[PDB]
Amino acid sequence: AQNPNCNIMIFHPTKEEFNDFDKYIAYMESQGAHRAGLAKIIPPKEWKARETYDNISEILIATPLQQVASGRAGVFTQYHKKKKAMTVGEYRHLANSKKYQTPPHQNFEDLERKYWKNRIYNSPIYGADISGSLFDENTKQWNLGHLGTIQDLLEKECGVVIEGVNTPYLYFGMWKTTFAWHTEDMDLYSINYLHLGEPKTWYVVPPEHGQRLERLARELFPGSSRGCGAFLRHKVALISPTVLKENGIPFNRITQEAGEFMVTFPYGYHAGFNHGFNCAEAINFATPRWIDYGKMASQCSCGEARVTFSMDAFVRILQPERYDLWKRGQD
Ligand SMILES: O=C(O)CNC(=O)C(=O)O
Ligand SMILES: [Mg+2]
Ligand code: NI
Ligand SMILES: [Zn+2]
């Protein structure tokens, strides 16, 4: 078996190997990359996502989210308080202010220490889940706005034709902005490109061990667990590397820098934070190996997680039994 210790693998495709997305994903998996739950892909040196970022200040963040923490430094929840709209210009100015800017630090490890020590005492503002793309339409390789759709994958694998579309989202981050422990909707893959700015640190649990993370989460967030049988779909819970180590949960960590792709694999729980002002673009995607994960994915039926138009059809076709009660939570 390849990659038995489930380490995060880093790939360096040539421009030749960067032409066929599906085939390169299948290659990574042949080398065991999926066992980690997360891979890094460094694009060929000749590739660019777009010519410059010079005019991005006019993008609107219509609902910035202030991420308010509760609990203890290593085990906390975050609530998203909706703020007034601001442009990317305004946001970047805010991120760079004395109140929100990245503190002095020696290296990524010192900054990671400061993050876990101090995250709870600040409420950074996250511009998340903004429908859009920053790839130039003339970028033909690994353009997250031109991937084949999950609906088309299901059609090609399973023969069923469903409604729905699949488009990317932009994320504008600042120091301490945080993504809580989650797998993707319907345990899909995701791919994330860091377009510009400061790094993003990731933590991930191997898919084969995801249930161990869930068991810990139920113990650490006991009332959440009683309220919903898939409360990690709410994307509010954080657990530090220290706490994961104390409880024997297998995980890995890696820092993504501007110009790099990360791919999360089905049922690979991940969480992380931003080092400073940045802009990422991400989208979900499917392969043939995903299909069974889609059939087995947990669902939030308490009604908090409240998910897309397109996810309806996935649940309808892959999880017909659930479909009924899941849509009671979604209506
Ligand atoms: O970048 C972020 O804030 C969150 N991204 C993801 O969870 C992902 O790409 O799967
Ligand atoms: Mg603009
Ligand atoms: Ni994700
Ligand atoms: Zn729920």
Domain boundaries, given as residue ranges, for the chain: 1-331
Q: Which residues contact 291 (CB under 8 A, 6 or more apart)?
A: 154, 157, 158, 318
Separation CA 239–CA 52 (nearest Å): 37
Structure tokens at 153: 């994958």
- Return the ligand number nearest the Cα of 263: 1
Separation CA 263–CA 271 (nearest Å): 13
SS3 34: helix
Nearest of 100, 136, 107 to residue 121 by alpha carbon? 100
Name the structure determination technique.
X-ray
Q: Distance between alpha carbon 125 and the CA centroid of its chain, in Å?
A: 17
Separation CA 74–CA 78 (nearest Å): 12
Fold (CATH) for 1-331: Jelly Rolls (2.60.120)
312: left (phi over 0), alpha (psi -120 to 50) or beta: alpha
Resolution (A): 1.8
On the CB side of 330, how many CA atoms lie within 13 Å of its CA?
Answer: 18
- Return the ligand number nearest the Cα of 232: 4
What residue's CA is closest to ligand 1, atom 2? 179
Separation CA 206–CA 213 (nearest Å): 10
Nearest of 194, 195, 180, 166 to residue 284 by alpha carbon? 166
Q: Are strands 65-72 and 125-131 parallel, antiparallel or unpaired?
A: antiparallel
Paired strand residues for 190? 264, 284
Residues shown for the chain: 331
Nearest of 297, 294, 301 to residue 324 by alpha carbon? 301
Q: Distance between alpha carbon 136 and the CA centroid of its chain, in Å?
A: 22
What residue's CA is closest to ligand 1, atom 10? 190
**6, 208 in Cβ contact below 8 A?**
yes
What residue's CA is closest to ligand 1, atom 7? 179
Separation CA 131–CA 124 (nearest Å): 21
Q: Which ligand 1 atom is nearest residue 284's CA?
A: 10
Q: What are phi and psi of 288, to 5 degrees?
A: -60, -35
SS3 24: helix
CA of 41 to the centre of ligand 4 (A): 33
